[PDB]
């Protein structure tokens, strides 16, 4: 799958820029079913000066956009300065109506497998946003989380 880099500008409110050596991979679901709410759209949204949340990769059924370098943290896990925000790579999976969720999930599993090998991160350390904050996210993968992970391998 193609990865397009379009970083949030340095110094922005949602680009804290703390050095990070990722030990985890945190999975999210955008909860945005609107037609057109794809990876490129999120890339554009994240660059708005007033946004405060941020993660590393947004995945849709066609491509993947990277908003942050992997040596920097993002604000997405909701655990302050805990490992979610300060020691994990955040990934968002789109739910846009004009996209195939099954194929977006497959693309995300490919990305996660690649990240695991390149950053020496174990499958056990691939966690849902919920793990860090108890929030019901990734809403479409929670009830079948273990299966989603079995599909990574």
Site membership for Zn ion, residue 42 (CB under 5 A): no
28 binds Zn ion (CB under 5 A): yes
- Under DSSP, the state recorded for 92 is E
Q: Which stretch binds Cl ion (CB under 5 A): 3-11, 19-27, 28-36, 99-107?
A: 28-36
At residue 63, what are phi and psi to the nearest 5 degrees?
-145, -175
- DSSP letter for 140, please: T
Question: Does 77 contact Zn ion by CB under 5 A?
Answer: no
The span of 36-44, 55-63, 104-112, 137-145 binding Cl ion (CB under 5 A) equals 137-145
Q: Which of residues 38-97 bind Cl ion (CB under 5 A)?
A: none
Residue 86 binds which entry of Zn ion, Cl ion, none, with Cβ cut-offs from 5 to 8 Å by kind? none
C-alpha neighbours within 13 Å on the C-beta side of residue 145:
18
Q: How far is the CB of 75 from Cl ion (least distance, A)?
A: 11
d(CA 153, CA 150): 6
Q: Are 115 and 1 in contact (CB under 8 A)?
A: no
Please tell me the count of residues contacting Zn ion according to CB under 5 A.
3
13 touches 51 (CB < 8 A): yes
Residues that bind Zn ion (CB under 5 A): 28, 129, 137
Residues that bind Cl ion (CB under 5 A): 28, 137
């Amino acid at each position: 799958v193609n990865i397009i880099q379009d970083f949030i500008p340095v110094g922005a409110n949602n680009r804290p820029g703390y050095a990070m050596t990722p030990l985890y991979i945190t999975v999210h679901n955008t909860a945005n079913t609107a037609v057109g709410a794809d990876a490129a759209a999120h890339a554009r949204y994240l660059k708005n000066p007033d946004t405060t949340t941020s993660w590393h990769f947004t995945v849709d059924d066609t491509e993947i956009y990277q908003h942050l370098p992997l040596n920097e943290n993002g604000w997405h896990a909701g655990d302050g300065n805990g490992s979610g925000n300060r020691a994990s790579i955040g990934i968002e999976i789109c739910e846009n109506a004009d996209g195939d969720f099954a194929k977006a999930t497959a693309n995300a599993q490919w990305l996660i497998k690649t990240l695991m090998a390149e950053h020496n991160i174990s499958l056990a350390n691939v966690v849902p946003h919920k793990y860090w904050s108890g929030k019901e996210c990734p809403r479409k993968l929670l009830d079948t989380w273990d299966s989603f992970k079995a599909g990574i391998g």
